[PDB]
């Protein structure tokens, strides 16, 4: 499957793509404002994620640091990124269908649209100004808006027992972005697409 990753932000981002124990495609790349990077994701990939990283420095070997979404200091990510990270999430070719969503469960750093480029389903978007509106206690001094699990490490925020409810913090993310996951047991906003659909992830879709 093809994923075109487009940076419409006015700032550079370092795109990342992983399934947690491996890179997807090259795993990461710099995208200056306006640039597009097309990756290939193997059919059947379960639990894949794409995200943006901000304010990164990499040396000649591809090792360094980012302020949001750092994946063990690598340009080419093999693992998931450090919160806060807005997440495009997908599982492909699962009994004949693909499943996509956007999640704020690991916080929010960059606005994003995640849409099919082929027929048969609708996209999702989380493009509100979550960083600007972020509750004071969730603001990441490194940049972005942390989720409450990251900040407070409680069973209720992290859904550790599988029994949790919405919270003041999850409701903030849900109010700003109704069509993204705000906590682990949120009413799902997953979209079912045809199996083997192709996609576009656009950072800063509104400008």
UniProtKB/Swiss-Prot annotation:
PROSITE patterns: THAUMATIN_1 (PS00316), THAUMATIN_2 (PS51367). Taste-modifying protein; intensely sweet-tasting. It is 100000 times sweeter than sucrose on a molar basis. Disulfide bonds join 9-204, 56-66, 71-77, 121-193, 126-177, 134-145, 149-158, 159-164. This is Thaumatin I. Belongs to the thaumatin family. PANTHER family: OS03G0233200 PROTEIN. GO terms for cellular component: cytoplasmic vesicle. Keywords: Cytoplasmic vesicle, Disulfide bond, Signal, Taste-modifying protein.
């Amino acid at each position: 499957a093809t994923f075109e990753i487009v940076n419409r932000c006015s700032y550079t981002v370092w795109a990342a793509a992983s399934k947690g124990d491996a890179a997807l495609d090259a795993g990461g790349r710099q995208l200056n404002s306006g640039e597009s990077w097309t990756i290939n994701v193997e059919p059947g990939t379960n639990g894949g994620k794409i995200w943006a990283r901000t304010d990164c420095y990499f040396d000649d070997s591809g090792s360094g640091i980012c302020k949001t979404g750092d994946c063990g200091g690598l340009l080419r990510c093999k693992r998931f990124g450090r919160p806060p990270t807005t997440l495009a999430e997908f599982s492909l070719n699962q009994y004949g269908k693909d499943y996509i969503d956007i999640s704020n469960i690991k916080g929010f750093n960059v606005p994003m649209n995640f849409s099919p480029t082929t027929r048969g389903c609708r996209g999702v978007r989380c493009a509100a100004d979550i960083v600007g509106q972020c509750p004071a206690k969730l603001k990441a001094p490194g940049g972005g808006c942390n989720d409450a699990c990251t900040v407070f490490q409680t069973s209720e925020y992290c859904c550790t027992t599988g029994k949790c409810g919405p919270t003041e913090y999850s409701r903030f993310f849900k109010r700003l972005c109704p069509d993204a996951f705000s906590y682990v047991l949120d009413k799902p906003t997953t979209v079912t697409c045809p199996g083997s659909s192709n996609y576009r992830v656009t950072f800063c879709p509104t400008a």
